[PDB]
Amino acid sequence: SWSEAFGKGAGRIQASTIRELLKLTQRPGILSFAGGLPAPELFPKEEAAEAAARILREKGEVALQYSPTEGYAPLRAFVAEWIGVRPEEVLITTGSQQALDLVGKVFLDEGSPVLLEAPSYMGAIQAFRLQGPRFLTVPAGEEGPDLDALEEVLKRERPRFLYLIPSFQNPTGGLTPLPARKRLLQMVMERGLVVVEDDAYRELYFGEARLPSLFELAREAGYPGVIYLGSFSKVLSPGLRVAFAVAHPEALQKLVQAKQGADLHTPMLNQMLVHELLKEGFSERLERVRRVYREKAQAMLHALDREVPKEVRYTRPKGGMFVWMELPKGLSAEGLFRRALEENVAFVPGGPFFANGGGENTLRLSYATLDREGIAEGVRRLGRALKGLLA
Amino acid sequence: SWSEAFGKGAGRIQASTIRELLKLTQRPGILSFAGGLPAPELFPKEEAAEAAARILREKGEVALQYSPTEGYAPLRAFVAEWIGVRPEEVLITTGSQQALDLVGKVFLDEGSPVLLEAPSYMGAIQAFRLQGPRFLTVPAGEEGPDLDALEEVLKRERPRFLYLIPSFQNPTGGLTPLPARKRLLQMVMERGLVVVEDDAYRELYFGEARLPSLFELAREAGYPGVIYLGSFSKVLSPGLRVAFAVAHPEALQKLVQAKQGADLHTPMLNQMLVHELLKEGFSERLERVRRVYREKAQAMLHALDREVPKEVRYTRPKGGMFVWMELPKGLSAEGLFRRALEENVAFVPGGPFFANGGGENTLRLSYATLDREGIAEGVRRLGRALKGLLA
Ligand SMILES: *Cc1c(COP(=O)(O)O)cnc(C)c1O
Ligand SMILES: *Cc1c(COP(=O)(O)O)cnc(C)c1O
Ligand SMILES: CC(C)C[C@H](N)C(=O)O
């Protein structure tokens, strides 16, 4: 009765990896390497308590009332200055996840081609699948998408957009280097193609500098086709659900009109709260997150080097939150997942990151949430798990 | 280029009368009867401020973290207890706007028939339009939907659901009476149809009691086909963006799953804040809400009775936030809108509340936001614009 009452969209949302992952802060028996849950030590609880009370006492009539679809104006200006655009070109979203939904709505139809990497971000796959697209993929490795494979796709297909995460890809941790960013921009400019650039990990670089985004390079070239997404989730607070999109006025208007119908506007308190927290001392805060994830990455890498047999490969990220692991072809990461849970350690099997399937032997390890010894203890429990499997 | 890069969904979100609405910060010499903005005098800023700081100090690690798609457990339980269902039958949404978006994705396809009133809630029309459905309408009256017209439509057509607002409809303020609710249910159960019941103004009744919802009647009868949408927007704070959907598990699970891809989850602070504010003294708060709006409605109606020429017709609501006004056929509400801007007063012309168009001589007035003396002044201005139009 219900199964016959649903429309086509109902058959396009079957995957439950996001919501199952979301139920990961147990109570609290789980050494979790699953879910890129930011370092809770980084949460400025006291500052947020202070700022939220003050907003509500002094600006409660704005904080509590319906508000414009585009965002809290001082947040839009803050973001405009940080990114290097005007406020009119910024839309505040209810996380970057909403932004992915909105891009799916404005650009995809049933059977529409969309290009993304294999593997790529699960939330993006989930948001886009809703529209019934044809997923076109290109492999993703340590240094970004395979551009020779892209070249071949582009001779045959015109994707509605390319979805890319040049800086520390979810789930691989891949970093697209500058000359590859440049070639990518050329290929896209030559064909007049649309890029969706998800920069959630922008500030989480372990090197001496971040690379220019595809958005910045496009902007220096005078190319209007890059839609740039950013978030305060990995930098401040996921729970607040505050992010942004930056786009050419025409693309932006479509996104604004779609967001209107999505949730009217992003909760105002949350935006005003993000602003209050960040408007002073943002750089210093950023330098600290950077310090913290570098350390957690180093702890996991050293623990893996000590605990993990050389028959299994894993990446060594230059930023972000993830180590991506590959078992020998023929071992299953879900199998591995069962055993890991029987040691009270969780990770994400790789399957869900692959839009068209495959990737059975792969898995994503997140070092974001646990401190050093929790990382060291989890990896040891994972070492015991993998060794029992390869034996 | 951009208009060539867009998909079909971009053609379907063209509408934008919520944005220019939500931009009504219009400073400050316009008296606006546009937009159902809850009375700011009702905002509990000080309780809100204290609750928020306490949440962020005591529970910041949860409030600021990624969180389950289903919602804050104690908010679900509070809702479940209020509405008379089980917690796991409650989905928390980022406004009732999100619930509508989600309902559209799971139920509607291109060329899908949906049925709603003419006129009806324009946020519903916007959310549903996105899917490219065929809108079937039924006239809305002071006693709700014309059930004779609904009977005729149902012979010819099987709508994927009926979207209705039985208690104080947006925009008419119509109240579907009990005998008409019982008949609507019979017509639906006979045919195994899905009802989406939007109950935003549930608690804003001006009489001695509220009428049972379609949802409560269905439940009494054992019929699983009503999806019930509630919101804290009209009783507490629209800005926080917290609302809920209640539905049969198969329906609800599809809603949770669509939500995963929409925003991951509703902000936890906001859900925690609403629950803290309501866990005690909710009935008493609702009684103050009711008194305030009864007062403002009576202020509105007396001013209209005093200032309005008898050739123009208007409703006398039994609750909610709106008066629906009809000009002599031949006259134009958009013209009045222009003239009313010369007399420094605003409202929402009726046109966009009509899915397939019509209602050019109709308009909606909101007594919700202005104080009683603002109401009397705004109406006297309206009365001057109207008598210029009538001469
Ligand atoms: C975390 C993430 C986002 C989604 O984050 P939000 O919390 O919705 O802002 C977007 N893209 C990538 C690649 C991410 O991993
Ligand atoms: C105000 C209103 C809503 C509530 O919208 P939210 O998204 O919860 O703020 C929903 N339906 C109708 C008919 C309304 O008038
Ligand atoms: C919803 C969560 C599972 C998503 C999170 N950003 C991650 O990739 O780990």
Side-chain angles (χ1 to χ4, degrees), chain A residues 1-13 15-26 28-359 361-391, chain B residues 1-13 15-26 28-359 361-391:
Chain A
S1 200
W2 280 112
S3 65
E4 182 56 71
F6 295 144
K8 280 191 202 131
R12 286 166 189 164
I13 57 181
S16 301
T17 331
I18 277 70
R19 71 136 130 194
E20 227 298 283
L21 285 185
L22 248 15
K23 297 144 169 154
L24 78 186
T25 303
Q26 267 180 200
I30 200 65
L31 291 191
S32 166
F33 304 128
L37 262 64
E41 60 268 62
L42 259 31
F43 292 157
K45 300 201 286 280
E46 185 51 54
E47 290 171 79
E50 189 288 313
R54 175 163 45 92
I55 286 156
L56 289 160
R57 284 178 174 112
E58 289 160 24
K59 279 165 174 165
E61 68 306 302
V62 42
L64 261 15
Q65 188 50 289
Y66 284 124
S67 145
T69 306
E70 296 91 344
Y72 181 48
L75 224 209
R76 295 223 278 165
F78 181 87
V79 169
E81 187 132 272
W82 179 26
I83 312 307
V85 295
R86 296 156 295 273
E88 44 177 10
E89 316 198 293
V90 177
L91 167 62
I92 306 312
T93 64
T94 311
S96 279
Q97 184 61 236
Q98 169 170 78
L100 298 169
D101 186 55
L102 308 174
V103 159
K105 292 169 170 177
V106 46
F107 292 103
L108 308 170
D109 303 307
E110 191 176 47
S112 278
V114 205
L115 189 147
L116 77 192
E117 297 160 287
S120 190
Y121 172 51
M122 214 170 30
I125 296 155
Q126 184 92 30
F128 304 158
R129 190 170 271 144
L130 212 214
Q131 315 299 148
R134 194 163 72 259
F135 289 101
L136 313 165
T137 65
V138 122
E142 205 107 9
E143 294 195 60
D146 174 353
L147 301 188
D148 298 287
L150 186 54
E151 186 166 327
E152 292 304 316
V153 178
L154 263 25
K155 281 167 185 165
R156 297 170 187 163
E157 205 76 51
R158 186 186 229 276
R160 293 304 226 286
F161 59 88
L162 292 61
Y163 172 79
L164 294 166
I165 308 155
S167 298
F168 326 113
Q169 202 231 35
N170 196 343
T172 67
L175 201 232
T176 309
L178 188 48
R181 285 173 194 235
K182 291 182 185 284
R183 160 149 85 125
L184 190 33
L185 178 61
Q186 252 288 75
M187 300 174 64
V188 140
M189 302 200 285
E190 221 203 355
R191 297 192 182 267
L193 291 169
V194 175
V195 168
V196 181
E197 183 181 17
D198 190 339
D199 213 16
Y201 302 95
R202 157 163 175 144
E203 294 293 332
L204 273 71
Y205 55 92
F206 304 152
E208 27 209 16
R210 64 173 185 93
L211 296 174
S213 64
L214 265 16
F215 182 90
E216 288 162 327
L217 263 348
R219 191 231 276 149
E220 161 189 72
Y223 188 69
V226 189
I227 298 176
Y228 179 82
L229 309 184
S231 185
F232 297 104
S233 281
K234 303 326 200 302
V235 106
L236 217 213
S237 163
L240 286 190
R241 316 302 306 126
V242 188
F244 58 89
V246 176
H248 177 283
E250 276 183 76
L252 210 267
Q253 271 303 117
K254 284 308 178 181
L255 296 175
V256 170
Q257 296 182 152
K259 175 177 170 52
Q260 184 170 322
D263 64 13
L264 300 177
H265 70 262
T266 290
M268 196 71 154
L269 193 233
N270 303 234
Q271 300 186 61
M272 299 173 83
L273 186 55
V274 164
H275 193 235
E276 289 300 311
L277 294 172
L278 261 29
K279 65 170 181 194
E280 290 253 292
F282 191 29
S283 291
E284 288 71 27
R285 174 179 301 281
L286 261 15
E287 211 106 346
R288 169 148 156 88
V289 324
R290 216 123 67 211
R291 228 153 49 235
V292 163
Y293 293 100
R294 192 187 316 119
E295 159 158 80
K296 288 162 143 95
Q298 277 292 288
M300 185 178 279
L301 285 176
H302 288 146
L304 293 161
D305 294 353
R306 131 172 61 75
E307 305 291 346
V308 173
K310 224 66 176 175
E311 291 90 68
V312 4
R313 300 125 255 156
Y314 48 91
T315 66
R316 313 186 80 79
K318 307 187 181 169
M321 295 182 165
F322 311 111
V323 173
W324 177 249
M325 170 176 293
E326 309 189 29
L327 317 177
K329 192 254 165 283
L331 298 191
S332 143
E334 263 273 312
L336 216 217
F337 178 81
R338 313 297 169 41
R339 311 164 173 261
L341 284 185
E342 293 164 13
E343 309 254 338
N344 285 15
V345 40
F347 58 79
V348 194
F353 299 91
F354 288 87
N356 289 149
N361 55 315
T362 69
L363 64 295
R364 186 191 76 177
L365 293 164
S366 178
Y367 47 77
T369 320
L370 300 165
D371 184 49
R372 304 192 63 258
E373 246 303 317
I375 303 280
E377 178 50 38
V379 167
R380 146 160 242 293
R381 293 180 190 177
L382 190 267
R384 303 190 313 214
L386 263 166
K387 262 273 143 261
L389 171 62
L390 281 98
Chain B
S1 212
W2 275 113
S3 74
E4 213 89 54
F6 295 149
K8 279 186 289 190
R12 289 150 178 177
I13 43 115
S16 260
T17 289
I18 289 101
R19 64 152 77 211
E20 228 284 297
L21 189 175
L22 272 41
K23 280 159 179 170
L24 75 197
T25 317
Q26 268 84 67
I30 199 96
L31 296 172
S32 142
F33 295 128
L37 272 72
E41 57 264 56
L42 247 13
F43 293 165
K45 287 180 292 207
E46 185 61 41
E47 295 177 82
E50 176 282 332
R54 209 197 329 124
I55 288 157
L56 286 169
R57 276 179 193 116
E58 294 178 7
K59 289 162 181 196
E61 48 292 327
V62 48
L64 263 14
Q65 199 53 277
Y66 279 131
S67 182
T69 315
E70 292 83 3
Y72 185 48
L75 220 208
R76 304 227 263 170
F78 172 100
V79 175
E81 158 149 271
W82 179 25
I83 302 312
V85 300
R86 282 155 300 267
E88 57 272 340
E89 282 188 300
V90 177
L91 168 65
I92 306 309
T93 68
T94 309
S96 277
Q97 189 61 216
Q98 176 170 73
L100 298 167
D101 178 48
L102 298 178
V103 152
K105 297 160 164 183
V106 335
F107 285 104
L108 297 182
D109 299 311
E110 188 163 289
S112 249
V114 249
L115 179 127
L116 71 196
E117 293 163 285
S120 195
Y121 176 45
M122 83 173 287
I125 297 163
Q126 164 96 14
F128 303 160
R129 197 167 262 152
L130 211 204
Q131 310 303 152
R134 177 180 59 270
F135 287 103
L136 313 162
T137 63
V138 131
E142 185 86 87
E143 281 198 354
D146 179 333
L147 299 172
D148 296 324
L150 180 69
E151 182 195 350
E152 297 302 286
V153 169
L154 262 26
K155 285 168 180 179
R156 303 153 189 207
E157 202 80 57
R158 193 198 210 290
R160 298 286 223 280
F161 57 89
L162 293 66
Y163 171 77
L164 292 165
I165 314 153
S167 316
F168 320 120
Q169 201 228 39
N170 194 340
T172 68
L175 196 252
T176 300
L178 181 58
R181 288 168 194 235
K182 298 192 179 270
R183 169 125 99 93
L184 194 61
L185 181 65
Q186 294 264 60
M187 297 168 75
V188 150
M189 292 192 294
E190 252 172 14
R191 290 194 195 261
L193 293 175
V194 172
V195 173
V196 177
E197 179 181 30
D198 194 331
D199 217 25
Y201 306 100
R202 161 160 173 149
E203 291 298 331
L204 271 69
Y205 53 95
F206 298 156
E208 28 207 16
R210 103 186 147 76
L211 294 173
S213 72
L214 278 45
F215 180 90
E216 291 167 313
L217 260 8
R219 203 231 283 159
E220 190 180 66
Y223 187 63
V226 189
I227 307 329
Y228 178 87
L229 316 182
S231 184
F232 297 107
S233 285
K234 303 328 197 303
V235 291
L236 216 219
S237 161
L240 291 177
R241 312 301 305 126
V242 7
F244 51 90
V246 179
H248 180 277
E250 291 187 75
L252 203 274
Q253 290 310 114
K254 290 298 175 176
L255 300 174
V256 176
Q257 286 178 168
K259 192 184 161 60
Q260 298 173 283
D263 63 10
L264 298 187
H265 72 266
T266 297
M268 203 61 162
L269 206 216
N270 303 232
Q271 296 182 61
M272 288 173 87
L273 183 61
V274 162
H275 181 245
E276 287 297 311
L277 281 162
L278 263 19
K279 65 193 205 203
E280 303 199 300
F282 188 33
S283 301
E284 298 69 49
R285 182 179 301 285
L286 265 9
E287 193 43 58
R288 168 162 169 41
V289 161
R290 226 115 62 200
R291 189 168 71 253
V292 157
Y293 288 115
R294 208 189 296 114
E295 217 153 293
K296 276 149 137 58
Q298 282 297 315
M300 168 110 309
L301 286 180
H302 290 163
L304 293 171
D305 291 340
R306 181 167 28 65
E307 317 287 341
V308 170
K310 189 70 73 184
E311 307 89 38
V312 14
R313 282 148 276 119
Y314 51 93
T315 58
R316 313 188 74 82
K318 297 170 184 178
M321 307 190 152
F322 311 117
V323 166
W324 180 248
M325 174 184 277
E326 305 168 69
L327 314 169
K329 212 273 206 247
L331 288 188
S332 197
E334 215 285 345
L336 213 216
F337 184 82
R338 275 194 171 117
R339 302 209 185 289
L341 293 176
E342 292 172 359
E343 304 284 320
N344 285 123
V345 60
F347 54 81
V348 190
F353 300 98
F354 291 84
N356 300 135
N361 66 320
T362 64
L363 56 307
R364 189 195 75 179
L365 303 172
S366 175
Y367 47 84
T369 323
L370 298 172
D371 208 328
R372 288 175 91 274
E373 181 52 58
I375 287 167
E377 178 58 14
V379 170
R380 91 155 283 267
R381 293 178 192 195
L382 220 199
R384 288 196 323 278
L386 278 169
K387 257 298 200 245
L389 183 74
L390 251 3

